[PDB]
Design a protein around this nucleic acid. Structure first.
Ligand SMILES: NCCC[C@H](N)CC(=O)NCCC[C@H](N)CC(=O)NCCC[C@H](N)CC(=O)N[C@@H]1[C@H](O)[C@@H](OC(N)=O)[C@@H](CO)O[C@H]1NC1=N[C@@H]2C(=O)NC[C@@H](O)[C@H]2N1
Lengths: 122, 79, 207, 82, 155, 130
RNA sequence: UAGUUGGUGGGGUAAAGGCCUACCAAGGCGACGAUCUGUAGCGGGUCUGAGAGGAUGAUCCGCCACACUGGGACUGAGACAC
RNA sequence: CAGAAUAAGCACCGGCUAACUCUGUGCCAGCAGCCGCGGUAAUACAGAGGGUGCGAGCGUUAAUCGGAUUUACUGGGCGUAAAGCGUGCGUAGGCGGCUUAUUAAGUCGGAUGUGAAAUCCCCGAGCUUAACUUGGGAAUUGCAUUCGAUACUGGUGAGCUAG
């Protein structure tokens, strides 16, 4: 570009879209579990992974992964969700916080307890 | 001791008033190239001596009307 | 917080004597496990390391001898970088100016931990007043004495006797009879051991 | 009216006053016309306790500025000291 | 003579019934007082490739006129799609550069320098660019000689 | 059309040096002669001549080669008609950490950046030579 | 854009002024973005960056605006007044 | 004065990136920032031992700048990677040959006024140290007025012929 072209029309900056639109620039969001179910991974992965469709206070309905082994969730549960992708699951962009509102911490876990929300053993 | 400007008349239709175009040359803040800017000032000219195309000098004054706050000093060059 | 626990594994991991014990018994007879890392997968000294590993291992060795944690050590580095001069020697001077280390080098404590406990328990007076902060920076021409109640301590007597075996620094003039001393100037780089390399530390903190 | 008074700064339990000439309607620690000294009621060691610019003080008093009681006492004490 | 190993890579060649694998090594040798060179080596196994690269490095060497322990002037250099910028620094700065530049500069004997890569960061190309920049750097004595003047006139 | 005769002169010198010519010729002007005189004083070129046929005027420059390479290694036009560059006395550019010259047009005539700093004036930065 | 742009007589204000009014003229603004529309309190400053730039305008200081939502005036040196 | 008496947790150990093994399970349960792990000997899943990094904290999520020369003024490109309008003419605009006189708008220099305080930086001072508070400087790269310079660009007058 020439100097005159730059003066007539400057440079253009393209805005970056957020990868967590449903949070709406908040660290976490509260939602009501609409449907808890299991899904299969995209190739080359095979499993039965636990996910829940949740309606958020932001007015959006999304899908959130349930981490750890063993969960007590069901329909009409109230959960807290944070950001975070699951990679091999198409369209799962959020995670459910363990042990926050109605979700419970994982059982018989003694390492990385702050994640999955397990208290200290006696 | 009074701020003054020199410009060229681009209108004399109004009664006792002229429109003089002031031109300045400044550097572009980012790209550095020297550019030219223009401003149009309404001025008071009591005796309608100024015409279209002359080069005049105008000094700041108290408001005379809604848009005029400058007054003619002299005609430097005539068309 | 100050580290509490085993010192011998800390010395073994860095691979050198960290002066963490009194010194009545040498390091080899004290530990018998030198040249071995504390882990079961512990190996010999010849194990190769990355540059990041070497820089980190040098900084940890420097921290462990003086008993300084990461936040305070990073603040020390940031001050040394701001002060005009050689950054590494500035950091070494700041580390050697702490009140606990001056008390230890004056021979009032058999270890730097003993010196720290003595300073903290208000047993040391700086310029005539009783202080209890180990990180106080000692300046030129200062006076460090032992408090009256602190005197007549067998730990202090053993400390001065053990220090007599070591060589009293040049920048410290200490009267052991009156349990008093004067910090005269900051030690120079030549006075400190040459095994300590500070270019790695400067690179690690300046990346 | 124009007053000469003390604006508070410093830390909690350790006040440090600037001696300011200001309109009395302004907030205590806000807009002021001119600062002409300071006062430190807890100065220790080498710290200065009171500095007042007598020339500016007299100039502003001659134009109708009214010092507060504390500032008048400080001005008298400073004149006595010097 | 200090020797640094910049990079080692495993490469493949396809034949009927499989692939033939080999190794390539890039090395930089220097004396730390203004003499430095670089080379590459290819072999079926890593140590032979390293030895061949070192031999090539010793064969391909140049002389660099340092100003103390830093550069004489800012240098811009390029080889292919790799561009490098180097700048003199005051004492105590260190070598603020990427690994590929760092090996060449340390082998040449530069102690304080600020450097930057633009474009591709391929190791061999970056080494080539730094090598060219150091080779083409000039000095006040040479400048005065070529202009027919004195170094005090040059300033 | 040609709209930068100074850039034309610098390009002619650059191409002649790259082609290893002994002399280079161009149409002459007072600004070009002033720049060539500064180059000759600083020692990048050997001789400057001006010849006149009638109204036409020709400028001839004798080039210098030391060892194998040309003496002028880099010559860059800085100010151009599309973008004029002016610098104050405190922001005059330095070429190759003072080993090169920046040609500056000041109100006291054309000089190097060193002379401009000594005189405490600024001006228009014409070219960098090294 | 038609009180719109300028002028004259008069009114009005603490004070210049289409601020208002009656006439006279057809002017005034706009590709250097008028009009319309979306968003937004502004600055000293704060964060980041080698720099140039980018983001931001809590706590402290200055200015502005608002006081359930709109339209007004009274008293007073001062308000169209939490 | 009494007596060690009242006072350690969190993340991680495939590469990026400091820190490795054994059991349990077998493309399941699960992990995952990216590349990827798990289909009977998993240093990558869970537990244990050991170790590493921090420490009254340790991790995760969200957000801004950086790395990004990835809007390139400093500082990028357009034969084949994304990118020359199908081709001309021409309006606004941008730029424009040589010589000379003059002007002083751009450009450069000096002086004066202003650029609130706080904040940033420097040397000190007081807090047992530090945070913090504070004295004085430096800085505020700007703006305005006025006085100068005339090489270059612009304006004006005159002249020329290589476009
Ligand atoms: N390329 C393959 C050509 C195949 C092609 N089909 C041929 C064809 O079709 N017709 C024939 C036409 C031939 C043509 N007329 C001649 C020609 O190509 N002139 C130009 C090439 C010059 C010469 N030949 C190559 C050369 O000097 N290299 C060196 C070399 O690699 C190495 O130095 C040594 N000493 O080892 C390195 C430093 O380590 O510096 C390089 N120098 C550079 N690197 C830089 C770079 O890239 N950019 C910018 C500048 O800075 C460059 N200088």
């Amino acid at each position: 570009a020439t100097t005159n072209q730059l003066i007539r029309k400057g440079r253009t900056t393209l805005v970056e879209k957020s990868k967590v639109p449903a949070l709406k620039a908040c660290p976490q969001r509260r939602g009501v579990c609409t449907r808890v179910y299991t899904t299969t991974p995209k190739k080359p992965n095979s499993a039965m992974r636990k996910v829940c469709r949740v309606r958020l206070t932001s007015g959006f309905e999304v899908s959130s992964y349930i981490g750890g082994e063993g969960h007590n969730l069901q329909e009409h549960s109230v959960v807290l969700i944070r950001g975070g992708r699951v990679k091999d699951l198409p369209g799962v962009r959020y995670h459910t916080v363990r042990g926050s509102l109605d979700c419970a911490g994982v059982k018989d876990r003694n390492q990385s307890r702050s994640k999955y929300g397990a208290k200290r053993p006696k | 001791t009074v701020r003054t400007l020199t410009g060229k008349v681009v209108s004399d239709k109004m009664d006792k008033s002229i429109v003089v175009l002031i031109e300045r040359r400044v550097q572009h803040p980012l790209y550095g190239k020297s550019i030219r800017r223009s401003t149009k000032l309404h001025a008071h000219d009591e005796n309608n001596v100024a015409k279209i195309g002359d080069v005049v000098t105008i000094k700041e004054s108290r408001p005379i009307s809604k848009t005029k706050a400058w007054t003619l000093v002299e005609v430097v060059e005539a068309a | 917080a100050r580290y509490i626990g085993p010192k011998c594994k800390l010395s073994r991991r860095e691979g050198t004597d960290l002066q963490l014990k009194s010194g009545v018994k040498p390091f080899d007879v004290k530990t018998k496990k030198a040249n071995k890392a504390p882990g079961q997968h512990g190996q010999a000294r010849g194990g190769k390391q990355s540059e990041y590993s070497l820089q980190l291992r040098e900084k940890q060795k420097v921290r462990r001898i003086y008993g300084v944690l990461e936040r305070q050590f990073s603040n020390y580095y940031k001050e040394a970088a701001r002060v005009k001069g050689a950054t590494g020697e500035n950091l070494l001077k700041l580390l050697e100016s702490r009140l606990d280390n001056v008390v230890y080098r004056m021979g009032f404590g058999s270890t730097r931990a003993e010196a720290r406990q003595l300073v903290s328990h208000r047993s040391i007076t700086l310029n005539g007043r009783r202080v209890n902060i180990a990180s106080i920076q000692v300046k030129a021409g200062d006076v460090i004495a032992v408090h009256e109640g602190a005197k007549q301590q067998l730990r202090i007597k053993n400390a001065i006797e053990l220090a007599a075996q070591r060589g009293i620094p040049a920048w410290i003039e200490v009267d052991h009879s009156k349990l008093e001393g004067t910090f005269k100037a900051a030690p120079d780089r030549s006075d400190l051991p040459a095994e300590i390399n500070e270019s790695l530390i400067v690179e690690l903190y300046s990346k | 009216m124009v007053v000469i008074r003390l604006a508070r700064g410093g830390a909690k339990k350790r006040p440090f006053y600037q001696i300011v000439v200001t309109d009395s309607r302004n907030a205590r620690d806000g807009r002021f016309i001119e600062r002409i000294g300071f006062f430190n009621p807890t100065a220790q060691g080498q710290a200065e306790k009171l500095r007042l610019d007598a020339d500016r003080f007299a100039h502003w008093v001659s134009q109708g500025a009214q010092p507060s009681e504390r500032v008048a006492s400080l001005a008298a004490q400073a004149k006595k000291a010097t | 003579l200090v020797e640094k190993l910049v990079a080692v890579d495993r490469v493949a060649k396809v034949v009927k019934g499989g692939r033939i694998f080999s190794f390539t090594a890039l090395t930089v040798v220097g004396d730390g007082n203004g003499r430095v060179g670089f080379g590459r080596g290819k072999a079926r196994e890593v140590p032979a490739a390293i030895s061949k690269a070192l031999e090539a490095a010793r064969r391909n060497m140049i002389t660099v006129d340092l100003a103390g322990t830093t550069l004489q002037h800012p240098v811009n250099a390029r080889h292919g799609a790799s561009r490098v910028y180097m700048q003199p620094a005051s004492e105590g700065t260190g070598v603020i550069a990427g690994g590929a530049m760092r090996a060449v500069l340390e082998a040449a004997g530069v102690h304080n320098v600020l450097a930057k890569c633009y474009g591709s960061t391929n190791a061999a190309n970056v080494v080539n660019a730094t090598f060219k920049g150091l080779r083409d750097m000039t000095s006040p004595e040479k400048v005065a000689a070529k202009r027919g003047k004195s170094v005090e006139e040059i300033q | 059309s040609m709209q930068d005769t100074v850039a034309d002169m610098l390009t002619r010198v650059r191409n002649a040096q790259m082609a290893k010519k002994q002399t280079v010729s161009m149409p002459s002007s007072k600004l070009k002669v002033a720049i060539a005189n500064v180059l000759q004083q600083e020692g990048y070129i050997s001789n400057v001549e001006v010849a006149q046929e009638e109204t036409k005027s020709t400028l001839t420059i004798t080039l210098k080669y030391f060892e194998g390479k040309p003496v002028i290694e880099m010559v860059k036009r800085v100010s151009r008609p599309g973008l004029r560059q002016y610098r104050g006395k405190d922001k005059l550019p330095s070429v190759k950490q003072g080993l090169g010259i920046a040609i500056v047009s000041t109100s006291k005539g054309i000089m190097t950046d060193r002379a401009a700093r000594a005189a405490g004036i600024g001006g228009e930065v014409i070219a960098f030579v090294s």
